[PDB]
């Protein structure tokens with residue numbers, strides 16, 4: 001038996017897919033993953049066959065860049081849907097089910113091919129702000145009607161906008177392969193019942209939502225830290241780690257610079273993850289260390305604190321690692337996750353994406369307080385629910401039926 | 402969409 005995983009997203013979505021692939025493997029089920037070209041290294045690492053779909057990393061926009069002209073936005077919107085119909089049929093060969101993660105629009109195309117081939121389809125989201133309800137506003141991933149804060153309206157408008165932008169292409173491609181048109185375009189990509197791949201304590205499913213909370217989808221990262229990093233950690237006190245994952249733009253470079261300054265102001269060493277936009281340290285003093293891709297599950301248990309962007313994966317990893325967290329939210333579901341770190345008492349939710357030496361220092365002081373550490377350690381034991389295992393069973397149960 | 406953001 002083989003399951004097709006389709007990911008249209010960043011590092012975080014790829015890792016969510018990798019985690020499921022790992023649980024399926026343990027069950028004796030093969031997997032194949034359609035993912036952006038940038039997933040190549042990670043997929044090669046875990047031995048999951050990769051079917052490249054989407055633009056390469058060097059064609060990715062960065063926070064701060066001007067939006068593309070409407071004609072170009074429309075072209076990308078159509079591409080997002082059309083690349084699924086072109087690539088999923090081939091990738092689905094010999095598969096019994098299909099699990100999509102990431103972009104909803106891409107998901108409508110994936111579900112359509114699955115529907116054509118008569119294969120069960122599942123879609124997961126990394127947080128409750130991607131599930132429509134009157135309780136939480138949608139993820140901050142697109143501009144919304146100026147002045148509107150009403151949760152219900154934001155969702156209704158988000159859905160209408162989505163249907164209008166992708167509906168025509170979706171339904172045209174569907175018709176070309178004999179499928180009747182989809183009327184509820186926004187709902188269609190979520191599948192019959194979307195899976196909330198997030199921890200029930202860290203990110204609890206809100207009421208009035210028809211979804212299955214499986215728990216976060218993570219694998220036991222066994223990768224060892226690189227020798228040079230293992231040495232740095234030994235030759236000194238527990239440093240503070242800075243990392244903003246798939247974030248981009250000059251804002252994070254500035255934030256990182258301020259973070260190093262503040263960390264030093266508290267007499268602590270620094271470890272800086274370069275990220276794909278290659279963030280750089282202020283100087284070469286031996287009190288700091290820059291790193292590229294590293295096992296965070298391992299690293300996070302050996303640091304005094306972590307400063308990050310608040311994306312689902314990095315926060316879950318930090319949360320189960322029991323390390324105090326300083327969250328500097330920038331977009332999508334990050335303000336939500338930052339608020340979660342605040343509510344659980346495991347760190348500080350910095351107020352906004354642009355920290356100053358003052359605000360960062362105040363937050364850092366709290367984050368490094370013994371109370372916070374004790375609290376983080378405690379909470380770490382409440383977020384162990386194995387989502388991938390729960391998800392894999394749902395998938396198999398569907399194939400069984 | 403299909404190349405990041407956020408705008």
Ligand SMILES: Cc1cn([C@H]2C[C@H](O)[C@@H](COP(=O)(O)OP(=O)(O)O)O2)c(=O)[nH]c1=O
Nearest residue numbers: 010011012015245246293294296311313314
């Ligand atoms: C950057 C980076 C990420 N990670 C992994 C752990 C997380 O579960 C996973 C996804 O994190 P996530 O923050 O959700 O992704 P993004 O930054 O794209 O929003 O990335 C590492 O293990 N090491 C690294 O160096």
Ligand SMILES: *[C@@H]1O[C@H](CO)[C@@H](O)[C@H](O)[C@H]1O
Nearest residue numbers: 009010013102103104402
């Ligand atoms: C990348 O952005 C998509 C939206 O188009 C979101 O669904 C993913 O979770 C995110 O990583």
Ligand SMILES: [K+]
Nearest residue numbers: 311312332333
């Ligand atoms: K995110």
